[PDB]
Amino acid sequence: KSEVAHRFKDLGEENFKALVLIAFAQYLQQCPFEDHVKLVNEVTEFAKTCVADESAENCDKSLHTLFGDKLCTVATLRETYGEMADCCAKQEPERNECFLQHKDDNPNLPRLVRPEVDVMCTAFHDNEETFLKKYLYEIARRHPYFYAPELLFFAKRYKAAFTECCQAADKAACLLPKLDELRDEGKASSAKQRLKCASLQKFGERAFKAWAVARLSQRFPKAEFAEVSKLVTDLTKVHTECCHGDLLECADDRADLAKYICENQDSISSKLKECCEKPLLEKSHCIAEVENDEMPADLPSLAADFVESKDVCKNYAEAKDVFLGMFLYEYARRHPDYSVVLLLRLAKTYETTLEKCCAAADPHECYAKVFDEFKPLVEEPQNLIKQNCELFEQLGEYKFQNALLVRYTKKVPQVSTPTLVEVSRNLGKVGSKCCKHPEAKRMPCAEDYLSVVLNQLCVLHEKTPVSDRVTKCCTESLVNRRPCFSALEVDETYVPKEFNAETFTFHADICTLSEKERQIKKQTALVELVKHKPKATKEQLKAVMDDFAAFVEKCCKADDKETCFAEE
Numbered sequence: 001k002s003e004v005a006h007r008f009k010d011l012g013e014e015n016f017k018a019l020v021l022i023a024f025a026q027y028l029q030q031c032p033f034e035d036h037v038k039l040v041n042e043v044t045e046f047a048k049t050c051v052a053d054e055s056a057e058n059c060d061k062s063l064h065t066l067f068g069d070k071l072c073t074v075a076t077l078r079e080t081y082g083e084m085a086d087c088c089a090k091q092e093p094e095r096n097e098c099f100l101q102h103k104d105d106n107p108n109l110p111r112l113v114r115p116e117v118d119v120m121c122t123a124f125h126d127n128e129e130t131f132l133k134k135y136l137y138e139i140a141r142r143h144p145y146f147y148a149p150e151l152l153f154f155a156k157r158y159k160a161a162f163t164e165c166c167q168a169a170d171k172a173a174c175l176l177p178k179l180d181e182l183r184d185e186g187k188a189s190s191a192k193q194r195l196k197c198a199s200l201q202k203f204g205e206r207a208f209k210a211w212a213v214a215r216l217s218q219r220f221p222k223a224e225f226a227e228v229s230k231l232v233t234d235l236t237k238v239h240t241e242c243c244h245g246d247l248l249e250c251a252d253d254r255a256d257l258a259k260y261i262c263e264n265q266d267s268i269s270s271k272l273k274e275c276c277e278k279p280l281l282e283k284s285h286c287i288a289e290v291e292n293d294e295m296p297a298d299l300p301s302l303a304a305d306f307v308e309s310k311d312v313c314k315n316y317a318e319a320k321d322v323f324l325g326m327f328l329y330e331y332a333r334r335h336p337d338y339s340v341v342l343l344l345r346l347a348k349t350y351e352t353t354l355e356k357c358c359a360a361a362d363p364h365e366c367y368a369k370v371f372d373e374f375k376p377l378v379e380e381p382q383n384l385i386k387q388n389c390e391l392f393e394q395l396g397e398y399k400f401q402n403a404l405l406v407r408y409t410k411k412v413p414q415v416s417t418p419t420l421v422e423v424s425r426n427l428g429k430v431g432s433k434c435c436k437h438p439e440a441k442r443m444p445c446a447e448d449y450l451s452v453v454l455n456q457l458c459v460l461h462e463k464t465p466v467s468d469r470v471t472k473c474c475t476e477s478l479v480n481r482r483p484c485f486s487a488l489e490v491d492e493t494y495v496p497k498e499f500n501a502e503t504f505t506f507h508a509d510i511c512t513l514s515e516k517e518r519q520i521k522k523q524t525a526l527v528e529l530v531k532h533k534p535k536a537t538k539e540q541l542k543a544v545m546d547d548f549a550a551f552v553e554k555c556c557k558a559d560d561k562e563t564c565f566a567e568e
C-alpha cells in the first residue's frame with residue numbers, strides 16, 4: 001500500500017518531481033508549461049502527505065489513477081485540444097492506454113526560440129530551477145518516449161553547461177559548442193530508445209529479451225548464462241515500464257539494477273570499476289554505454305553442445321527458450337564483431353530448423369548441416385557495408401546524404417519530403433560514425449545504427465501512412481528491416497509529381513539561416529525534384545544540385561533586393 005510514498009522515498013524528491021513532470025509532458029504534449037508545473041506540485045505535496053503516512057485516505061491508490069485524475073482535471077476541454085477529452089470520459093480501464101495510444105512522434109510544436117547567450121544566462125541566474133523545469137518540459141514533449149533517468153542525466157549536464165559557462169570569460173564560445181554536442185547526444189538517446197519501445201510494443205517481450213541477451217552477451221563475454229539471464233530479466237522490466245509510461249518505477253528499478261551490477265562486477269565484467277565510482281545518474285548512463293569486456297580465451301566450439309550432441313532435441317524439448325537463449329548467448333559472446341540483429345536471426349534460423357529436424361527422419365543427420373546457412377546471412381551486410389563505406393569516403397557526408405536521398409526517395413516516393421530528408425541525413429551520419437572503425441567494429445556499429453534510423457522512418461510514416469512498401473518492411477519482422485529496405489528497388493508504378501513553381505524556388509529568407517539549415521533546405525528541394533522527375537537521373541541531378549548551391553551562394557551575397565532569386 002502507498003505507491004507514491006514507496007517511490008518518493010527511493011527516488012528522492014528532486015527527481016521524483018523531475019520524473020513526474022516528464023510524465024505529464026509526455027502524456028499531454030500540448031499543455032502549456034505553467035499548468036504542468038501546477039499539476040506536478042499538487043502531485044508532489046499530495047505525495048508527501050502520503051509519506052506523512054499511508055492511511056492518507058487517497059494514498060493507497062495506483063500511480064495510474066492519480067496521474068489520470070490530475071490530468072483529467074483539465075484534459076476535458078476539446079476546442080483547444082482534440083480527441084484527448086475522450087480519454088477522460090473513459091476510466092483507468094482504457095483511459096491510460098488511450099493516452100499512450102495518442103502519443104505523437106512528430107508533434108506539430110512551434111519552433112524553439114533561441115535567445116542570445118546573455119539573455120539565457122540572465123534567465124538562468126534569475127530562477128534556475130524554473131529554467132531547468134522548462135528544459136525537461138520541452139524535450140519530453142517532443143520526445144514522448146525519451147528514456148527518462150537518462151533525461152535526468154542530460155538535465156544534469158545541461159545545467160552544468162550553464163553554471164560553468166556563465167561564469168567563464170566568453171560565455172558564447174563556451175556554451176554553444178557544449179549545447180550542440182549535448183543536442184546531438186540527446187537526439188541519439190531519443191532515437192535509440194524509440195527503437196526499444198517499438199520492439200517492445202510491436203513485437204512482444206521475447207523479441208526484446210532476445211535483443212537484450214544478444215547485446216549483454218557481446219558485452220559481458222565472461223559472465224555465466226545465469227547472470228546474463230538475470231540482467232536481461234531486470235532490464236526488460238525496466239524498459240517495459242519506461243515504454244509503458246510507468247516512469248517512477250522504470251527509474252527506481254533502473255537505479256536498483258545499477259546497484260546490483262556495481263556489486264557483482266567480478267561475476268559481470270572488468271570495465272565497471274570506473275563507472276562504479278560515479279554519481280548515481282552517470283552510473284546508469286556509463287553502465288549502459290560501457291565497452292565490451294574482452295572475450296574469454298579458450299572457449300569451446302559450439303558444435304559440442306549445439307550440433308554434435310543429440311541431447312539437442314530433448315534438452316530443447318524441455319526448456320526451449322532457455323536453450324535458445326543459451327545458444328544465442330554462446331554465439332553472441334563469441335562474436336563481439338556481429339551486429340545484434342544478425343545474431344538474432346541466426347538464432348531464428350537455428351530454431352526454425354530445430355523445430356523441423358527434431359521431427360524429421362534422423363534429427364542429427366538432417367540438422368547436422370546448420371552452420372552452413374549462417375554464411376549467407378553473415379555475408380550480406382559485410383558486403384553492403386563495405387560498398388557503402390567506400391562510397392562515403394568517395395563523397396563526404398553531405399554528398400553521401402544527397403546520394404541516399406535520391407536512392408530512397410526512388411524506392412519510396414509516396415512518403416513526405418520532410419521525413420525523407422530527415423531519415424536520410426541521419427543515414428549519412430552513419431558514415432562519419434562507423435567507417436572509421438576496423439572490420440570487426442564496423443558491422444555491429446553500422447547495422448545496429450541503421451536499425452534505429454530505419455525505425456525512425458517507420459514510426460514517422462506510421463502516423464500518416466502513404467507507401468505500402470514502407471509498411472511491409474516495417475511490420476514483417478523487425479530483424480529483417482534493414483535487408484528488406486536494402487533489397488528494395490525503384491518503384492515504377494508511380495507517375496511524375498506534376499510540377500509546382502513554389503516548390504522549386506528558393507526564397508531570400510535563407511541567407512539568414514545556418515549552413516546546416518541551408519543544406520537541409522536544398523535536399524528538401526532535391527527530393528522534391530526526384531518526386532517530380534524520377535526519369536532522367538544520372539549526372540543531370542548532381543548537375544542541378546550543384547547549380548542550386550551555386551545559385552543561392554551568388555544571390556545571398558547580392559547586395560540586391562532579393563531579386564536574383566526571383567528571376568531564375
Ligand SMILES: Cc1cc(OCCCc2c3n(c4c(-c5c(C)nn(C)c5C)c(Cl)ccc24)CCCN(c2cc(C(=O)O)cc4c2ccn4C)C3=O)cc(C)c1Cl
Nearest residue numbers: 112113114115120134135138139154176179182183186187
Ligand atoms: C537531450 C537533448 C538536449 C538538448 O540540449 C541543448 C538544448 C536544446 C535547446 C536549445 N534551446 C533550448 C531551450 C530554450 C528556448 C526555447 N528558449 N530558451 C531561452 C531556451 C534556453 C529550451 Cl527551454 C530547452 C532546450 C533547448 C535554445 C533554443 C534552441 N536551441 C538551439 C538550436 C540550434 C539549432 O538546432 O540550429 C542552435 C542554437 C540553439 C541555441 C543556441 N544555438 C546556436 C538549443 O540549443 C537538445 C536536444 C534536442 C536534446 Cl534531444
